[PDB]
Amino acid sequence: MKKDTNEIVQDLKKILGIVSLIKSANNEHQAYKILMENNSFIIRTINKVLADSNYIIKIIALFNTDVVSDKIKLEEYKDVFSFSKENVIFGIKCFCDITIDGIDQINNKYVSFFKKVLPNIILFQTSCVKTTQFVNIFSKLSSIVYSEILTNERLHVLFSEIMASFKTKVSVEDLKKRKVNNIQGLISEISNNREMYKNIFVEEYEKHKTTLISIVQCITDNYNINYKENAVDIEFIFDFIQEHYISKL
Ligand SMILES: CCCCCC/C=C/CCCCCCCCCC(=O)O[C@H](COC(=O)CCCCCCCCCCCCCCC)COP(=O)(O)OC[C@@H](O)CO
Numbered sequence: 346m347k348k349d350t351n352e353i354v355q356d357l358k359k360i361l362g363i364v365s366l367i368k369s370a371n372n373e374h375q376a377y378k379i380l381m382e383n384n385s386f387i388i389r390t391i392n393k394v395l396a397d398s399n400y401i402i403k404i405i406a407l408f409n410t411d412v413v414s415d416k417i418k419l420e421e422y423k424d425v426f427s428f429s430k431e432n433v434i435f436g437i438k439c440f441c442d443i444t445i446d447g448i449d450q451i452n453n454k455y456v457s458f459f460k461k462v463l464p465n466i467i468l469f470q471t472s473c474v475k476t477t478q479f480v481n482i483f484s485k486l487s488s489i490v491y492s493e494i495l496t497n498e499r500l501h502v503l504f505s506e507i508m509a510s511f512k513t514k515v516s517v518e519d520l521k522k523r524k525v526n527n528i529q530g531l532i533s534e535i536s537n538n539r540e541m542y543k544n545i546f547v548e549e550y551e552k553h554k555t556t557l558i559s560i561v562q563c564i565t566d567n568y569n570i571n572y573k574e575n576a577v578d579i580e581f582i583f584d585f586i587q588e589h590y591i592s593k594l
Pocket residue numbers: 543544546547550551579582583584586587591592593594
């Protein structure tokens with residue numbers, strides 16, 4: 346699967362390329378043109394990701410070259426991280442039970458873009474969830490995520506402190522001089538320095554957990570985001586992903 350992990354780096358380059366075209370675009374109508382000119386790529390990729398029950402394990406394999414050299418590891422990874430067509434269906438159904446009464450509906454050209462692709466996402470049609478609802482939740486959520494990452498001040502503070510602490514453990518100047526600036530260089534740096542970057546991640550996460558949970562919980566509260574007409578428990582979600590997913594890497 347050296348070509349399939351090649352597939353993922355090739356897809357991420359084209360994705361980041363779409364992104365840099367949208368960021369540096371003069372207005373919405375230009376970004377909407379940019380998304381439509383990539384219309385078949387975005388729909389093919391979603392469909393291709395969702396039908397590849399091993400896609401997550403192929404992402405792990407970019408970062409652990411030592412996994413491809415051991416089918417026991419790979420298969421103990423497929424036990425945790427492989428998802429089926431019905432897992433995808435189940436996850437879409439669960440997605441539409443999120444309510445965000447905290448902000449009006451979004452209708453810009455991204456939302457109109459979003460509704461043009463969904464009748465071609467095969468497994469989304471299979472779910473028989475109403476497009477109006479799914480679009481509404483997805484557009485409200487991604488509007489919140491992007492707005493909070495750009496505008497939330499506690500998040501900016503926290504990002505700054507993790508950034509500074511990072512710089513005291515890794516020489517970013519010497520990384521830039523060894524040309525670890527691109528996506529491939531960055532992938533290779535992490536995969537060859539696995540144990541360290543993962544310990545850096547764990548330690549920064551543990552040091553800053555209370556802030557991070559608090560910030561995200563205050564976001565879900567301040568937009569009244571519910572799951573099954575109930576408050577969302579960020580702490581429980583984060584501890585959950587930790588015990589069943591992150592810890593098994
Ligand atoms: C811009 C693109 C970025 C997107 C990419 C997404 C990447 C996600 C994860 C990538 C890397 C994750 C961490 C890698 C570390 C792997 C090892 C590991 O994390 O497993 C172990 C679990 O512990 C631990 O802290 C685990 C640390 C806990 C982390 C909890 C994560 C919670 C995040 C929740 C986000 C969910 C989103 C939904 C929002 C509601 C830690 O390592 P070990 O040496 O076994 O032991 C040391 C400790 O266990 C104590 O003994």
